Amino acid sequence: GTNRSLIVTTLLEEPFVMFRKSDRTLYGNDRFEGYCIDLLKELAHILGFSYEIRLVEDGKYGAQDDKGQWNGMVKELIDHKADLAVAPLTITHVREKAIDFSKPFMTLGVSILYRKGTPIDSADDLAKQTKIEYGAVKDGATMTFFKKSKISTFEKMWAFMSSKPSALVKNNEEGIQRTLTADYALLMESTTIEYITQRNCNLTQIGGLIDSKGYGIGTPMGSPYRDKITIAILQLQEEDKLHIMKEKWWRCP
Amino acid sequence: GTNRSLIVTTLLEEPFVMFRKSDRTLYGNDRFEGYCIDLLKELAHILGFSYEIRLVEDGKYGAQDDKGQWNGMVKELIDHKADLAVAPLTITHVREKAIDFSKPFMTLGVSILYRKGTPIDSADDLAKQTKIEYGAVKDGATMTFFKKSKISTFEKMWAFMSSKPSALVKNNEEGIQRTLTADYALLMESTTIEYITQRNCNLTQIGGLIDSKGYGIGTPMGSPYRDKITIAILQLQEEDKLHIMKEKWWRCP
Numbered sequence A, B: 001g002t003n004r005s006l007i008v009t010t011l012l013e014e015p016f017v018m019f020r021k022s023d024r025t026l027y028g029n030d031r032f033e034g035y036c037i038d039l040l041k042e043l044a045h046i047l048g049f050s051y052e053i054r055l056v057e058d059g060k061y062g063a064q065d066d067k068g069q070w071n072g073m074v075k076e077l078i079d080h081k082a083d084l085a086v087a088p089l090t091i092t093h094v095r096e097k098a099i100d101f102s103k104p105f106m107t108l109g110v111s112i113l114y115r116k117g118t119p120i121d122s123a124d125d126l127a128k129q130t131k132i133e134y135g136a137v138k139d140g141a142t143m144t145f146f147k148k149s150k151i152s153t154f155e156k157m158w159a160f161m162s163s164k165p166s167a168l169v170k171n172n173e174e175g176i177q178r179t180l181t182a183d184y185a186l187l188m189e190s191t192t193i194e195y196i197t198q199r200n201c202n203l204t205q206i207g208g209l210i211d212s213k214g215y216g217i218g219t220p221m222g223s224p225y226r227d228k229i230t231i232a233i234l235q236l237q238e239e240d241k242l243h244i245m246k247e248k249w250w251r252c253p
Ligand SMILES: N[C@@H](CCC(=O)O)C(=O)O
Pocket: A061, A062, A088, A089, A090, A136, A137, A139, A140, A141, A142, A143, A187, A188, A189
């Protein structure tokens, strides 16, 4: 209870959480590596806890349907099926109504991922047309941002995204593949765009950040572990350790 | 001191925290009433704690200066000079880097307060001119939102606000008085606009919400009281008690 291993829910998302490469068939925690895994390891060392990592079955971050029911990692936390969600889980007002988060460990904002070619320069350029299709990860924070926005440009974008069955993609990976194979722009969080555009040299960020927010480790509301994790994150940041960790995992003509 | 009274920092802001009317000279907690005071009282009853309310000396909510030093209620929490900040304290990413918040007890967004007359309709209308001056409360969340935005319209607005000495006002009251005596629009949080426009029938909200976020009870990072307060808030909301409390305090031709 006070010594048990914490159940950690996560999902695969480069470079935060990945299956590490090996010839062996791997099992347990050893399967995983990445920025969020390094963060979890450092926290576990500092705070003296152990854990078991489990992939969220539905592969989603989490959003509410019209009856108010959640899915994804958010639902795992609400149900107390996990103690921590260690992932690039965006801290949002709608989620703070249902679950808790550590202090943020990374800052990001929504922006646009698109192929180098047609020189569009902003969301305004996307919103005023449909030839270039656009969308976001289904049941993630970006989708929810557009769904909830009352800013005219973003309302127009939500009207389009939500009417076009192909527009909302299962995960970043499907979205990135779409930007590579179709005339499609993905509304994406900015540090992920940074990572992707350093590796796919034909992709680029379009425009700037639409907002500025954070990723946190999710917990069930009122978790006994959340506070110590927050304080440990704060101290890692005072010493620039998270900046260094980012450089490790983010490290074109 | 697991029985000690909690120190509560606050500031005067109608209808959240106000000096109650009396012929007597009042002292201590008895001086205060309002939506946030009712919320505090209900939480204290549910959770079995006592408190001493103190007005923040500088009358500010809190923002960081160029060297990263905070002021206002946020600084009181950072310094652990208060246990709770019971006020309409906006939950924001930049603040979550330094302090903690309960789950939100109220949803709001930035909008515009302006005198019925010139029929402007949106922030875009303000941003494209200067005859109608505009601004926000100095060292509050709205100011910070504009200072940090990379959305073109809001960048232009910040460029103007931050150049014009009169534009940033000390508190809502000064800003409201300014909308009444000058051709000035105040960027203001929406539930406060709702309260003000029901009482000052010559004022109105211009446009919709620019964002959607929450007020929470602020605590120092690491607080032993924050979780129980969050759970109690959740349960008040499940039963619609906060909606009823808003009707009480918010209740023209
Ligand atoms: N990090 C997001 C998912 C990605 C996105 O929505 O763009 C979340 O927590 O929902």
